[PDB]
Symmetry: C3
Subunit: 171 residues, 3 copies
């Protein structure tokens, strides 16, 4: 019936506070959702778990017997990353073979060299029911496994007690 005042329409039309722009609505429609933010956080967690499993998995290398020794059991060094070092756990049993039963029976790779300034000394069992058949084994700074004393040169010697850490070297 009655007509609207131009002033009232004008004030409404010029009230920018109660209207929007087309570009505003595109901006707001594109904002992140709670489900999208949670998916990204879930993926960060999954990536973290995968990185941890990778970092903490056990690695292995096979060692070749030297100086006439034989690998009566396969000579295997297993190792685990801890920070920028490795924990190295040797395994296997060496036999006299054609050598003397003494001396260097195997050498580990250079990246498994021990953190040490001279030989490290290990007590090892020999494969024997006589408890006097044990060994004094040196692990050298270049990672030679050097059998220095044995109860008997004719009895096999175990390497399963040789465990050590490497130097602080980025990897």
């Amino acid at each position: 019936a009655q007509f609207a005042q131009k002033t009232v329409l004008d004030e409404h039309v010029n009230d920018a506070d109660i209207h929007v722009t087309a570009t505003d609505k595109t901006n707001w429609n594109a904002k992140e959702t709670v489900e999208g933010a949670q998916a990204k956080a879930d993926k960060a967690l999954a990536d973290a778990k995968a990185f941890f499993e990778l970092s903490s998995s056990v690695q292995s290398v096979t060692l070749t017997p030297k100086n006439g020794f034989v690998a009566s059991q396969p000579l295997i060094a297993r190792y685990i990353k801890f920070g920028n070092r490795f924990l190295v756990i040797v395994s296997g049993i060496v036999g006299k073979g054609t050598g003397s039963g003494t001396g260097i029976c195997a050498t580990l790779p250079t990246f498994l060299a021990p953190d040490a300034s001279w030989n490290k000394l290990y007590s090892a069992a020999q494969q024997s029911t006589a408890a006097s058949n044990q060994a004094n084994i040196y692990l050298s700074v270049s990672a030679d496994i050097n059998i220095v004393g044995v109860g008997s040169v004719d009895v096999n010697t175990g390497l399963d007690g040789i465990i050590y850490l490497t130097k602080e070297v980025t990897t």
Copy 2:
């Protein structure tokens, strides 16, 4: 003169670009906030740290002495997960008890069997000031701890030096 033109009111009411809908406002009010996204990221970080602490925690089991041996100190196998295997660290001291002082003194759980194709060999101390009282221990592929030779059957034998990686 002072009245508003119908053409002007009509163009305004049909400018959908500058107006919204109830559905728009519900959608926009429900969008993620900066603190809400940060809370979710913070929770992911806390969950990662908790998962790491759990995955690297030590588990323990007290072992049953076998073949007449006694647990002069409790025989405990402690173990840590690494990837798809465990690092196992045995502890305790066995006494002769009603047995001979040699043979299988304990067997670890099957899932802690060593990664090996034959026995693993360990030198062990006995509980003695005589250094000839030591022991040769074989850890079998079925995780038997077999004291195969000792300096003296009448002296206790330690298990604290047995450490190894399992299979799988």
Copy 3:
């Protein structure tokens, strides 16, 4: 006729559902972006990796020889956190020095005390070609390294095989 009806203007002006407020618009402009949420997730991943790498790094402490023994090679305990415990890996070689060749040659720090109710028993190599020159070592509950028996008191004794877990703390 050509003029706008006051009822139609009034109805539009009173339709709050199709209009907004200044506060609405600040609320929506402040909302998180896909890029911003992804940056926060990326930082959570980077922080997790940094925490893991630090947490699993090896720590070291040098031990002082006691009771007249000497350190022919430095006595160093290296240790790794595993949950609420530590794995301790001892290293070094002790000599008789001015002592007797037996007894407590070194004590580890209190926070590296072993999880044990009595001594833990270790066989150690001596620096000798005679395999009868080995040692029985007791690690006490107070973390004393006690050389209880040796084949020869005049030959050095290695500590490189002593590995153990601490208590839950």
